[PDB]
């Protein structure tokens, strides 16, 4: 997250870190046994870390659970990143508490202007690299379809939406993918891609979660 702020330990209880010897992507806990993330983050042997703040030092509230299943959306295009969504089933159910809680799914899509919260342990520099130890937060609005399509001609589908600031300086970045975009307690988006980080006229692009609620529930039932 670039241009954001330190959230504060466990203030974003549904945020999880996907680990394979190190943090490489984020994800969102939707129920005690399932995590929503990005398809391009797919990897085998993933260890889901919950209740985290400082991903490097032991603080006492984390629950490390292996991924028994990692289901990528059947229509995921690795070149256009269309349908960039993935479901991960924990080998065992997580112990829900105040530091580890699930975020609910949207019942209707959010409109342009909707104000949301984006978080992650991604790079915090618009130029160069600096990975944080603690979770970062950013308040950001969903942008109009007009501005999104204008910012990325012929690159945005109906399963995507932009959020952030056209002026730059505030954005998600490498390491935040899979992470959440929550608006009024609803997971409306997943960090997916963007041209650079916090660059002018280059806002972040996010997977439009509301288009997959049906697929998510159907997948959870069949697994």
């Amino acid at each position: 997250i670039v241009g954001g702020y330190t959230c504060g330990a466990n203030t974003v209880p549904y945020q999880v870190s996907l680990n394979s010897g190190y943090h490489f992507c984020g994800g969102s806990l939707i129920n005690s046994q399932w995590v929503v993330s990005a398809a391009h983050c797919y990897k085998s042997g993933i260890q889901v870390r919950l209740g985290e703040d400082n991903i490097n030092v032991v603080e006492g509230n984390e629950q490390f659970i292996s991924a028994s299943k990692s289901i990528v959306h059947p229509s995921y295009n690795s070149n256009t990143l269309n349908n960039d969504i993935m479901l991960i089933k924990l080998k065992s159910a997580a112990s829900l508490n105040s530091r580890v809680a699930s975020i609910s799914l949207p019942t209707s899509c959010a409109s342009a202007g909707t104000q949301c919260l984006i978080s992650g342990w991604g790079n915090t520099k618009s130029s160069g690299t600096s990975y944080p130890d603690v979770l970062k937060c950013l308040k950001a609005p969903i942008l109009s379809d007009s501005s999104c399509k204008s910012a990325y001609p012929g690159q945005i589908t109906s399963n995507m939406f932009c959020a952030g600031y056209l002026e730059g300086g505030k954005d998600s970045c490498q390491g935040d993918a899979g992470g959440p975009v929550v608006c009024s307690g609803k997971l409306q988006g997943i960090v997916s891609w963007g041209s650079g980080c916090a660059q002018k006229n280059k806002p972040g692009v996010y997977t439009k979660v509301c288009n997959y609620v049906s697929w998510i529930k159907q997948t959870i039932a069949s697994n």
């Binding site: 998600s172 490498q174 891609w193 963007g194 650079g196 972040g204």
Partner: protein, 375 residues
């Protein structure tokens, strides 16, 4: 009939034969040579050869005389060399030949005509009677030819030398998508498992035509040059250099040149100024081309006055790679990148590479970098 169909598949096999010969001698030497440059030079020479001397040359360059007419071979090299000599090319690649025969020899006119029209090359007369002046003269030619890039190419001339051939090539391309000089840093380069050297390492986070091949046990990277040329690098996994050098085929290399899909990666590629100098008599001789270098050599196509054989033949290749590329220091070079942590692919250990001409797909260069900081 496109140039490709006339010589490329053949140049590829030649490239592999010469490479493997050098790679089988040592696994720790740097290698750099031009398949194109060397083959063109001897295809040109075959114009003055006859009998088995002539057949042995072309068959030594991996050309089957009973499958493609000699005219096709020469027309191919003519077309390719023609394109590489274009004063107006963004590639900025210069290659040439040096034909030196003892003064006093009545030369065959047909030969000198073909060498000029087909291979855009020239012949020169020198008095080998004085080994030192002859040497200074030959080096003077390469000196003027490479505009100072290659000095004192030849260091020894046998007393009875009557004919010597010099072949050289120099290349320094500019990338379509450059590296920021500001991001270049000194980094460890693992010559082997227990030895490292510091080398300037260019690096950039972006979308690259890069991927790991389980078949070659290597990461494969393709970088397009501004100027219709492509560089492809093979980074073998630990201890798999010999495996890689052994599994390379024209089909496998072609497979990579056909695929354009890219993926995010934080690439670290070393900056480098490398060279290669070879005694073609020793090298080509191991590839079966020995008669044109023997006492029973038939070069009556070059001269009919008296017997003649190639006394000396040397190839010199020079390649430079740095951050320089296109002009657009800004958002122009802003690519759409997925936001997961991208793999950090480092070319920090021995690797193999080739530089392929864009239109003909001919192998301009083939080499191996074991130690980028030492000859």
């Amino acid at each position: 009939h496109p140039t490709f169909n006339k010589i490329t598949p053949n140049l590829a096999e030649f490239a592999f034969s010469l490479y493997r010969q050098l790679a089988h001698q040592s696994n720790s030497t740097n290698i750099l040579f031009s398949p194109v440059s060397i083959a063109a030079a001897f295809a040109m020479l075959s114009l003055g050869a006859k009998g088995d001397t002539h057949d042995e040359i072309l068959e030594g360059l991996n050309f089957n005389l009973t499958e493609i007419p000699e005219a096709q071979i020469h027309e191919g090299f003519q077309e390719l060399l023609r394109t590489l000599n274009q004063p107006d090319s963004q590639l900025q690649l210069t290659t040439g030949n040096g034909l030196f025969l003892s003064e006093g020899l009545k030369l065959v006119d047909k030969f000198l005509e073909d060498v000029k029209k087909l291979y855009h090359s020239e012949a020169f007369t020198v008095n080998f009677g004085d080994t030192e002046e002859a040497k200074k003269q030959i080096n003077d030619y390469v000196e003027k030819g490479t505009q100072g890039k290659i000095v004192d190419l030849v260091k020894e001339l046998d007393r009875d030398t009557v004919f010597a051939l010099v072949n050289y090539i120099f290349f320094k391309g500019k990338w379509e998508r450059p590296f920021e000089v500001k991001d270049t840093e000194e980094e460890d380069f693992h010559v082997d498992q227990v030895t490292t050297v510091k080398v300037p390492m260019m690096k950039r986070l972006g979308m690259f035509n890069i991927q790991h091949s389980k078949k070659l046990s290597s990461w494969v990277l393709l970088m397009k040059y501004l100027g219709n040329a492509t560089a492809i690098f093979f980074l073998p996994d630990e201890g798999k250099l010999q495996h890689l050098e052994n599994e390379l085929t024209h089909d496998i290399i072609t497979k990579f040149l056909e695929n354009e899909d890219r993926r995010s990666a934080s690439l670290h590629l070393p900056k480098l100024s490398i060279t290669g100098t070879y005694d073609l008599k020793s090298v080509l001789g191991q590839l079966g081309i020995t008669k044109v270098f023997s006492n029973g050599a038939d070069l009556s196509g070059v001269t009919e006055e008296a017997p003649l054989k190639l006394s000396k033949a040397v190839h010199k290749a020079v390649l430079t790679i740095d951050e320089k590329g296109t002009e657009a220091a800004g958002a122009m070079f802003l690519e759409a990148i997925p936001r997961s942590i991208p793999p950090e692919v480092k070319f920090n250990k021995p690797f193999v590479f080739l530089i392929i001409e864009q239109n003909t797909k001919a192998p301009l260069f083939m080499g191996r970098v074991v130690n980028p900081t030492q000859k």
